[PDB]
Design an enzyme around this catalytic site. Sequence first.
Site, PDB file in Angstrom:
ATOM      1  N   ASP C 107     -27.215  34.157  75.925  1.00  7.94           N
ATOM      2  CA  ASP C 107     -26.037  34.107  75.070  1.00  7.94           C
ATOM      3  C   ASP C 107     -24.744  34.338  75.844  1.00  7.94           C
ATOM      4  OD1 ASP C 107     -25.148  37.075  74.894  1.00  7.94           O
ATOM      5  OD2 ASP C 107     -27.283  37.186  74.405  1.00  7.94           O
ATOM      6  N   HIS C 145     -30.702  34.755  84.432  1.00  9.41           N
ATOM      7  CA  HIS C 145     -31.765  33.962  83.816  1.00  9.41           C
ATOM      8  C   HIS C 145     -31.242  32.678  83.174  1.00  9.41           C
ATOM      9  CE1 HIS C 145     -34.980  37.386  83.534  1.00  9.41           C
ATOM     10  NE2 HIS C 145     -34.671  37.042  84.773  1.00  9.41           N
ATOM     11  N   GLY C 282      11.835  57.130  73.868  1.00  6.85           N
ATOM     12  CA  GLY C 282      13.012  57.941  73.630  1.00  6.85           C
ATOM     13  C   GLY C 282      14.270  57.498  74.344  1.00  6.85           C
ATOM     14  N   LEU C 319      18.324  54.715  77.445  1.00  4.99           N
ATOM     15  CA  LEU C 319      19.481  55.426  77.980  1.00  4.99           C
ATOM     16  C   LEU C 319      19.426  56.916  77.654  1.00  4.99           C
ATOM     17  CD1 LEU C 319      22.135  55.316  79.504  1.00  4.99           C
ATOM     18  CD2 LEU C 319      23.287  54.776  77.351  1.00  4.99           C
ATOM     19  N   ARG C 361       8.051  45.107  73.194  1.00  7.52           N
ATOM     20  CA  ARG C 361       7.596  46.469  72.924  1.00  7.52           C
ATOM     21  C   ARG C 361       6.090  46.538  72.719  1.00  7.52           C
ATOM     22  NH1 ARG C 361      12.372  48.205  68.866  1.00  7.52           N
ATOM     23  NH2 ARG C 361      14.022  48.429  70.449  1.00  7.52           N
ATOM     24  N   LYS C 378      21.584  57.329  69.601  1.00  9.39           N
ATOM     25  CA  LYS C 378      22.520  56.518  70.377  1.00  9.39           C
ATOM     26  C   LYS C 378      23.825  56.409  69.596  1.00  9.39           C
ATOM     27  N   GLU C 393       8.828  51.738  67.684  1.00 13.67           N
ATOM     28  CA  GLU C 393       7.850  51.997  68.731  1.00 13.67           C
ATOM     29  C   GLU C 393       6.738  52.899  68.216  1.00 13.67           C
ATOM     30  OE1 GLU C 393      10.142  53.521  71.984  1.00 13.67           O
ATOM     31  OE2 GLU C 393      11.311  51.668  72.124  1.00 13.67           O
TER      32      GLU C 393
END
Lengths: 461, 406, 458, 401
Positions: C107, C145, C282, C319, C361, C378, C393
């Site tokens: 298989d 085999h 972060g 940042l 991401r 930010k 995230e």
Amino acid sequence: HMNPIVELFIKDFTKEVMEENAAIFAGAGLSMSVGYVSWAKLLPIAQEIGLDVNDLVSLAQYYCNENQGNRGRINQIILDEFSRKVDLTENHKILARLPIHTYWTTNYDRLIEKALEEENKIADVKYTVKQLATTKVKRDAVVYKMHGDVEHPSEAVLIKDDYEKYSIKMDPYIKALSGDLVSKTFLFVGFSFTDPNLDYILSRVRSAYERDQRRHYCLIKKEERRPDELEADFEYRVRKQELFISDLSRFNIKTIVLNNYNEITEILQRIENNIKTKTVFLSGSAVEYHWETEHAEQFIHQLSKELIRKDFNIVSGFGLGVGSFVINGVLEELYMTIDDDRLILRPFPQGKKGEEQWDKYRRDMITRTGVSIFLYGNKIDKVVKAKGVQSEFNISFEQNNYVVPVGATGIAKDLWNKVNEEFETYYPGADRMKKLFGELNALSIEELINTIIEFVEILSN
Amino acid sequence: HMNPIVELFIKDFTKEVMEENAAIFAGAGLSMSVGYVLDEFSRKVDLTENHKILARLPIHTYWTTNYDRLIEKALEEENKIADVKYTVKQLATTKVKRDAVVYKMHGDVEHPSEIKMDPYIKALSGDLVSKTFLFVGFSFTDPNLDYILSRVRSAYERDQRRHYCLIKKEERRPDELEADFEYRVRKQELFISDLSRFNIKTIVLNNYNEITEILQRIENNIKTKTVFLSGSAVEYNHWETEHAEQFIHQLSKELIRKDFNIVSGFGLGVGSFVINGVLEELYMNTIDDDRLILRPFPQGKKGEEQWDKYRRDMITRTGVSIFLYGNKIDKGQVVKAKGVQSEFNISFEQNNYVVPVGIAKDLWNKVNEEFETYYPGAMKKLFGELNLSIEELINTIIEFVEILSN
Amino acid sequence: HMNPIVELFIKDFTKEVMEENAAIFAGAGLSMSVGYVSWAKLLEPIAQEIGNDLVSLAQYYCNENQGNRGRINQIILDEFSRKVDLTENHKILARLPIHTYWTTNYDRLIEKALEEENKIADVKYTVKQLATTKVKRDAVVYKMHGDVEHPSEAVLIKDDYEKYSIKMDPYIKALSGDLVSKTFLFVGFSFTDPNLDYILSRVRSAYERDQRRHYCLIKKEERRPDELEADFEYRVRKQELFISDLSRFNIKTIVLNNYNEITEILQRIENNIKTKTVFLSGSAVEYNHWETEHAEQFIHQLSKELIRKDFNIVSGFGLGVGSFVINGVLEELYMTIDDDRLILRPFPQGKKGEEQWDKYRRDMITRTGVSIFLYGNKIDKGQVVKAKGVQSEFNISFEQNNYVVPVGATGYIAKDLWNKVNEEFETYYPGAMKKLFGELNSIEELINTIIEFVEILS
Amino acid sequence: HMNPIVELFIKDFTKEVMEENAAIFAGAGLSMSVGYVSIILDEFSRKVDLTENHKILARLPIHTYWTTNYDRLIEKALEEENKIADVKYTVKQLATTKVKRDAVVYKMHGDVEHPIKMDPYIKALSGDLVSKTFLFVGFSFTDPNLDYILSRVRSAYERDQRRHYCLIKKEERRPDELEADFEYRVRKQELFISDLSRFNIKTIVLNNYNEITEILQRIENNIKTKTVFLSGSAHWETEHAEQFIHQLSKELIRKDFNIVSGFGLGVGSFVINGVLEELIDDDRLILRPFPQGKKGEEQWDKYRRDMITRTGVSIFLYGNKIDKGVVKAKGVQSEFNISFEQNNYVVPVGATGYIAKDLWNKVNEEFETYYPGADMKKLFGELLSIEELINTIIEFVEILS
């Protein structure tokens, strides 16, 4: 839309594909995004060895040396370059969605079988002589790879010489191909006049000027003038293409000349359309209707019947207020013994476990279709609108299906208003078509049925 | 049951038939009731059971050197469309909705006057590469088989596809010398050798009737792998509603697990759980329609008008019918479901194997008393064991059906 | 969780797998959902006609006419194909950094699982294929085999080894070398396996010491409902002799209660691996209530003592966080950056850049198995505003079943996620360590908290 | 360039090296500067030294070394290259696997500081000869052990085996000696070639031993020239230049190149965009953005050298930044310096260049110190449309490879 020759081919080959006995013969061009292979330019590799194309006889005798290691190494290099130059295309995907069960190819790549498996189809891939003796269980398509497979470089056939040296491994494939060209209608694609093996193979499997042969088709791109080149060079390529077309004509293979390779895709798309629009999904449930229930039952009934009368196929989720009469309408025409391609019933499993997978169930039954007709859509909860039908609408539209809501049978009406307003997002075009669509949201049964049927027919351009 | 060679052939050819890649080449012997042998020929032949079994098999390729129209006749009597080829031009066309192609090389009794037969040679060569053939109706006195084979097969390929030819052993005639008989035997042996050189294995039967038996067996092997699940229930005998639901569910699920096919009428109390059980195994890692065919009944006067033809139609697809429960609701109370009894009757009139899991009990008694009429042979323990736990009952049913599908 | 022997195996093989030089040898049992193969029932499709008598079959199969071989092979392989399926075992193994697979199966389950994980498999079942090296391959799969799509070439019985050494010996050689050099896990083999003992007899030496230790996982033989006790103790004796024979080749046999435990074991191993590559999420303009240098030094030594404890870091270079993650890494590494220790994926700015930020991401987080969340603020329109990116995230992190570790003490959006986790805590961490989590909402102490928490996760 | 046989070997072995499946088997000749060898072992050890071959090999991603030498030149060269060597000279050591190793060194005849026990090693070598492509080097026809070992680890009856290679030097006439003696030595070398040929080991006969080094250099080139360093920070309109960077990156990636970027402002994001357009991420794109602040700039230099170390060719674009309110970016010039001190091919696109122009003019003058050779001169000067410029660059670097 396209030129009369291309349209004629589209209709004829659609006929041959739909009868599920058509075959594809694919050249290296199909494995390229640009649609062709510059065979000379592909083989810059002899420049990388310092053997400029004198040295070719040394290369030929090195390759054909008793020590098969040579053959294996050179095959490995060339194959590797090929693999580093090929990609999957929309052509492969469209072909994989079509009911084509026979593929012939001289390609080493696994693009065809890949496209087949991505469509959840089982591919019987044969590139050795022994594999012709086996039959893969539950296969949907056979893929004959005459010249070998990329995962077996030493056994690969690169030059015609192998046919001369090892006929014991090549003749069975040639026999099979000859038979297939007698019995199945082929589309040759990915071959240009510079192809190193096609004329030989055809010379091995077809008779020239032989009358009453099966007609096959080949799609190529028109040779166009290059900016920095003499006009004699252009007329040279034109002459070569003309000779190629003539030779193909000698074997009753009609050549269709396109303006660009992208047209191939377009053609394929169209063909698929012609197929997918012939299997219809009937969405709808009803406890309430403003017609008498028995009359409405007859509307659904003869809608189904004159769907079947015009060679359409029906897939139904067996809605409570609709399904039984769809069945009745189908049986009226069929029992005059149920072909499996005409009516496929998918009643919903009731209970928690069923509803857990009702969505996948719906997507599964709608995938089979290319056009969804929407009728009524009400149920008993308290009479309440049936959210399931709108869900089927959503799934239909995310699946790029033609949406046909009959607003006369008012949830159907809601979607007809959602589509009639902001109508360019569902049917980019205007043609009878705009009037017919509007005519669906209080005539007779025959008239409404005629409206729906003719709209759906207009859809299969 | 039969000797190992015939059994091996039965298995290989069963696989080839089920995979719709089998071919038949019929000699003059197949058109004779006795199994062996111009204008007179048509006047001396007519249809046999072999033709009917073959017509009922999903075989799409027939080659023949016969002039009679027995193959196409048998095909049409089974309501299938035959694409008949006797001219070169007809090879360029493909008959719409055809079920089988019939190549009649030496021409047809109709169109008597009918070299440039090259396209047919191509077709036959290709077919012999790709399709598994059964040669039947050919004896060693046949004037054309060896020629055709010499033109369509190579004797230098050993790894080619295996084909088969069924013949009858030569027997001594009452009052005849032994040298003449040994002469005929020697010639049959040379015939077998000649066929062997083209990788066509010859199986020698004791009598022509064995051909039929083999065919029958093949048909069995096919028809017994699609199961019809009959039953409806509001109450479930001696189990909890949910428990019965787990029983139906996983019975269906390992019907699908052992490569069986299910046809269901979607009876209330059974259908949804059959579907669930199927989807559990099928949605693992889309619904193939050769795996599950649902035929819910249309409600209303107009539907009930054709409920009977509907039932025979869905049962025709199957060769084995499993019967579960069979209760309804008529006026507030639980009542036996006449539909299951109708489906049982139809199952038996269609010569299908009937497997009632003890309305189900009623049919189990109908089978257990007249058991020689349903299963001539001994199985007997399992059948009685059908009337235990859920795993045990499911294993009982499945292994019984497995024994049926040898 | 499990018994000390199994746990020990988990640690040893985790160690061997993590250096990316471990190999798997898969028997027919691995291709089964129930985890094993009843070989007799496998023999039945050939035994179904007429079942002393076996020599007639042996001489039919070994007849000059290869059609016989092809037919028998076809029947048996077809039975296999109708009896096999893909399992969670295959998927887990495919996600592991294992580059060597040996099998006697026909298989294509292993190669399938590898490809579903977007890995390139160099599959070899012919002698000639050993001469080739597939470009950009991630794993080699030796199918000693043969292959299911090549039934006539398939090896069914040991007899082939005797008849065609020219086709088998190179595979035997390769296997011998690998068993010398790579640590193997044997799985899918029972004491009824028709070829394993022969193969081992040809690729391993008995009673010779200092051999590499390999492992074999089996299930203990259990009594069947209503049957005599002599048959059971017979099977027990057979399993004991099998274990002894494998022990003879320095192959340690581990005996489990059921086949599902295999999966469980595999799961554990994957965990141990996936939790060693960390995603640091972060960005910051403000750092809660600490002086900028102090917080930056917190991030710095968090990274530095993540790496000190052999962890791997993937960073989107946010940042206010990224540069100091880099600094913390470089302090420990420049004592020359190994690629799998620090992977930086800074975001492309602009419309064309933002057009693929989601896939970017997801691409980041896929490399990792645990995501730590710091701060997340930010400037949005002149004032300090929470950074939605960190929340995205987080979402992507959990949808990929990565362990989510939000440090709410040093955090804004981080704090938000700390409440998202403390609330509905059963949905993220089924188990009890609860104190360590609570300690997330000093610098050395906080870092120790984080690290020992993620360590406890592994 | 070199003869077709050698070129074929170079391509095949390059593939095997790149796929990290190449092996080296080293004879005594490799431990000698003269390339061959004319109680004893002590003198031998006192007679060996490190060669450029060892360094080239140590720099290559080769993970398997077999040797019959007593000297430790291989492991020494590896460790000088900051690689971890798993050294095997006992049977028991085969059962262990040294952590974070870059190469395994089988010293099957021992080590000078290490004065049956064959069988595991025989197994390992046999397997390796089945699966890995070997380069035999440092063996001459007078070698006492090669034929024995080969007879023990390879079969002469397997024809479809993996092909291996052995490099030797052609026998040449010695000053003033008879032709019969020379023809004797030639005959012996020819028989040696025959013996190796029986085990499917192809022997390539070179004109001199330094050609070995040259071949190795060529291979190394083939490796390092496939990873490109994109230097630059930021004539044309901004969007147009951004798409220039975009498509330069995009079919740098399309033509099987690898990109290492410092993610400079005005360049990095578009390098990234261009890469993902072609595209989940492999060894194709390595981003090393610079850490800001005093502590970061404290390690910016080592950061840069580490960046450029992964690459063998550096392309230089633009190079401008904002300081105290447009000013030349010294960093790009630093990356140029590091590039040249690291023997990387320098490709400054002086066209839409600032510092790129300074370095392009610095290159056009004294052009022999950067590219010892000539046309290539036209292409360098050509450093037009966007497609034309990117194609110019690409063809220049391709000519380099």
